[PDB]
Structure 1
Amino acid sequence: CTVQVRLELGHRAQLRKKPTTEGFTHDWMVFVRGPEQCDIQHFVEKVVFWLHDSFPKPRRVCKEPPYKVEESGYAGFIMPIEVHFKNKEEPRKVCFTYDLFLNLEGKVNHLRCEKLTFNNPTTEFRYKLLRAGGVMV
């Protein structure tokens, strides 16, 4: 028995009308979500966004939804994201390398779908999956 569930990683970034005291030109938000009609909270323990050096306390953790980070900045960067599962057996997380990229002349609305595949999950984990929109194959 194999269950597949869907994740959407994405971000929006708009160019500020006025930069901040520190010369931050953009506001952005990055997120992890289920597709429409999918609360991934049921099988997602927490999400960890490993921001760049320059943000204070850059290991950002969301234990409940929304799994998001809102900040201001001046540049884009590569960002590891780790989704940890409400699973007591392996696998207990998955990592994506996310590219938080900015539009210097306007906005960015970016979306990227990732399909997770869990093999022979435990009985109570297979719920969390199916409760979150999972599909059996």
Structure 2
Amino acid sequence: QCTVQVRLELGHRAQLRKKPTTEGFTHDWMVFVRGPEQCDIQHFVEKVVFWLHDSFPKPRRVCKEPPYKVEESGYAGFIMPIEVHFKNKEEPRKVCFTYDLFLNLEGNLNHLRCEKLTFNNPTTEFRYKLLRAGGVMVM
């Protein structure tokens, strides 16, 4: 028996444009999923799916390799499902987050959300992937 814990960071930044875009978009924002502190999550992460509001074109954005991030311009905040799929050949194959992509009016915004995943009795190949990315076997 064996249990592994590994950390992901979800974040975004948002800046109020000095000049809005032609469509009237007031902000530049960027959303990402990364490993903390030098850790590389590509070892166990197969792809990240960012589901953008359907006002955006091709709202289902996919990154299959780092950096796992979406850069965009818009005018309001919105709820953004985020799927992180794993390099696993058994369940669980993905985790889903509900991310609040919010913009403020005062100008500069940075947000960071620290998530912790636990995998119970992973295969030994997947376990190696987890640890190479900064994971932790536990009680």
**Normalising by the residue count of structure 1, what TM-score does the alignment of the two structures yield?**
0.99
Q: Distance in 1 between matches of 2:96 and 2:54?
A: 19
Q: Equivalent residue of 2:38, what SS?
A: coil
Alignment: residue pair count? 137
Q: Which residue number corresponds to residue 49 of structure 1? A: 50
Q: Which contiguous aligned blocks of 4+ residues in structure 1 show a shift greater than 2 angstroms?
A: none
Q: Distance in 1 between matches of 2:97 and 2:117?
A: 11
Q: Distance in 2 between matches of 1:77 and 1:63?
A: 24
**Could you tell me how far 1:69 is from its partner in structure 2?**
0.2
**Could you tell me how far 1:103 is from its partner in structure 2?**
1.1
Instruction: Please list the CA deviations of residues 87-121 of structure 1 after superposition, one character each: whole Å capped at 9, or x if unmatched.
Output: 00000000000000001121110001000000000
**Could you tell me how far 1:136 is from its partner in structure 2?**
1.1
* Matched-pair identity in %: 99
Q: Distance in 2 between matches of 1:85 and 1:105?
A: 37
Q: Distance in 1 between matches of 2:81 and 2:67?
A: 18
Q: Distance in 2 between matches of 1:35 and 1:20?
A: 33
Unmatched tracts of structure 1, length 5 or more: none
**Could you tell me how far 1:37 is from its partner in structure 2?**
1.6
Q: Distance in 2 between matches of 1:123 and 1:26?
A: 45
C-alpha RMSD of the superposition: 0.4
Q: Equivalent residue of 1:31, what SS?
A: strand
Instruction: Please list the CA deviations of residues 25-48 of structure 1 after superposition, one character each: whole Å capped at 9, or x if unmatched.
Output: 000000000001210000000000
**Could you tell me how far 1:82 is from its partner in structure 2?**
0.3
